[PDB]
A paper describes a structure:
Members of the myomesin protein family function as molecular bridges that connect major filament systems in the central M-band of muscle sarcomeres, which is a central locus of passive stress sensing. Our data reveal a dimeric tail-to-tail filament structure of about 360 Å in length, which is folded into an irregular superhelical coil arrangement of almost identical α-helix/domain modules. The myomesin filament can be stretched to about 2.5-fold its original length by reversible unfolding of these linkers, a mechanism that to our knowledge has not been observed previously.
First, we determined the overall architecture of the complete myomesin domain array, including Ig domains My9–My10–My11–My12–My13, from crystal structures of a total of three filament fragments: the My9–My11 triplet, determined at 2.5 Å resolution; the My10–My11 doublet, at 1.9 Å resolution; and the homodimeric My11–My13 triplet at 3.5 Å resolution. Although the structure-based sequence similarity of the five Ig domains is generally below 25%, all Ig domains except My13 belong to different sub-classes of the C-set type Ig domain topology. Remarkably, all five Ig domains of the myomesin filament are connected by α-helices that are identical in terms of orientation with respect to the preceding Ig domain, and they form a substantial, structurally highly conserved Ig domain/helix interface with an area of 350–600 Å2. These interfaces involve loops that form the C-terminal tip region in each Ig domain, and residues from the first three helical turns form various specific interactions that shield the N-terminal part of each α-helix from being completely exposed. We refer hereafter to this as the “IgH” segment, which to our knowledge has not been found in any other muscle filament protein with repetitive Ig or Fn-III domains. Whereas long six-turn helices are found in the My10–My11 and My12–My13 connecting segments, the corresponding helices in the other two connecting segments, My9–My10 and My11–My12, are slightly shorter, with about four turns each. Because of the smaller length of their linkers, My9–My10 and My11–My12 show limited direct interactions in their respective Ig doublets, whereas in the other two doublets, My10–My11 and My12–My13, the neighboring My domains are too far away from each other to form an interface.
Author numbering: 1141 to 1404, 1409 to 1447
The structure:
C-alpha cells in the first residue's frame, strides 16, 4: 500500500502527505524527524483531517535534512518514511522555483536571413504556444510596432514567430530581442547585428531586391559581345528573357537610334563591311510597363 508522497503546488509550496484507510476512533497521526518528534518545530506545520495528513515546510533548506516518519496509533505499529538528503534538497528547490517562475521552452533562438525579394526575415521557434501567448519586439532597448516598416506574424500551432523588413537602412544596425510571455511563463531570445555581420546582410538584401525587380521586366541573360562573320562583317549578339509583344527593342550608335527590332532569346545587329566609320558606343535598351534593362558595348576601329 501507501507511502509518504511529496507534492510541490503551483505556488512552489513543498509538503509531505500521508493517508491511512485502517483507522480507529482513537487512531492518530504523529510525525518524527530522525526518530524525534517534530512537535513544536518552528521549521514546519502539520494538519490532519479525517484519514489524511500533510506536513508543510515553511522554508526548506539545509537544516531540514533527515528521515521523516509517520506513525499511526492503534494500528499495526508500522511507520512510513521519506528521505531528505542533500541531492533531494536540490531537486525540490528547483521544482519550487520553476512553478513560481516557469520558462516557455525554446526550440531555436532568434536568427536572421535574406529571403527571395531581398526581404529581411527575423525569426525564432518556441516549443509550444497557447492561444493566449504574446510577443513584444525591441530594437536598441526601445519598443517597436506593426506599421509601414515592421510587419509581424505568429503562428500559434507551430510556435513560429516572425518580423519582416523590406530593407536595412544604416540606422538599423544594433540589437534585436523577442520577448515572450505565455501564461505566468516567460522567455526572451536576442540577436546582435553589428559590424561585419550587419553590412554582410544589408549588402545582400540590396542586391537581391534590385535583381528581383529587373527580372520582372524584359532583361539580359547575356550582355553585348561581338564576332566576325561573312565577308568581313561584324555581328553583335546578346541573350534576352521575359520578352512580351508590346516590348520595344531599340539599337543606338553614339546616342542615335539606328534600328528598331520586332522579328523573333538571341538579339543581333549586323554591321556590313566593317571599318573606321562603324566605330562608336553601341547600346540596346529593352522596354514596357513592367520595367526597362540595358546593355552597352564600346567599339574601336583601330581607335
Amino acid at each position: 500500500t501507501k507511502e509518504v508522497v511529496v507534492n510541490v503546488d503551483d505556488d512552489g509550496v513543498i509538503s509531505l502527505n500521508f493517508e491511512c484507510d485502517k483507522m480507529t476512533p482513537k487512531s492518530e497521526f504523529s510525525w518524527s524527524k530522525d526518530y524525534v518528534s517534530t512537535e513544536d518545530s518552528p521549521r514546519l506545520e502539520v494538519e490532519s483531517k479525517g484519514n489524511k495528513t500533510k506536513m508543510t515546510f515553511k522554508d526548506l533548506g539545509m537544516d531540514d535534512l533527515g528521515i521523516y516518519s509517520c506513525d499511526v496509533t492503534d494500528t499495526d505499529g508500522i511507520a512510513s518514511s521519506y528521505l531528505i538528503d542533500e541531492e533531494e534538497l536540490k531537486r525540490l528547490l528547483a521544482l519550487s522555483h520553476e512553478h513560481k517562475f516557469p520558462t516557455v521552452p525554446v526550440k531555436s533562438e532568434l536568427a536572421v536571413e535574406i529571403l527571395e525579394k531581398g526581404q529581411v526575415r527575423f525569426w525564432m521557434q518556441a516549443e509550444k504556444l497557447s492561444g493566449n501567448a504574446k510577443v513584444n519586439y525591441i530594437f536598441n532597448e526601445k519598443e517597436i510596432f506593426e506599421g509601414p516598416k515592421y510587419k509581424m506574424h505568429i503562428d500559434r500551432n507551430t510556435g513560429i514567430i516572425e518580423m519582416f523588413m523590406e530593407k536595412l537602412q544604416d540606422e538599423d544596425e544594433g540589437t534585436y530581442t523577442f520577448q515572450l510571455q505565455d501564461g505566468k511563463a516567460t522567455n526572451h531570445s536576442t540577436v546582435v547585428l553589428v559590424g561585419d555581420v550587419f553590412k554582410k546582410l544589408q549588402k545582400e538584401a540590396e542586391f537581391q531586391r534590385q535583381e528581383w525587380i529587373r527580372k520582372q521586366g524584359p532583361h539580359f541573360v547575356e550582355y553585348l559581345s561581338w564576332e566576325v562573320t561573312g565577308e568581313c562583317n561584324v555581328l553583335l549578339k546578346c541573350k534576352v528573357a521575359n520578352i512580351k509583344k508590346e516590348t520595344h527593342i531599340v539599337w543606338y550608335k553614339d546616342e542615335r537610334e539606328i534600328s528598331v527590332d520586332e522579328k523573333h532569346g538571341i538579339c543581333t545587329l549586323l554591321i556590313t563591311e566593317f571599318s573606321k566609320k562603324d566605330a562608336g558606343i553601341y547600346e540596346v535598351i529593352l522596354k514596357d510597363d513592367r520595367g526597362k534593362d540595358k546593355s552597352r558595348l564600346k567599339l574601336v576601329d583601330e581607335a
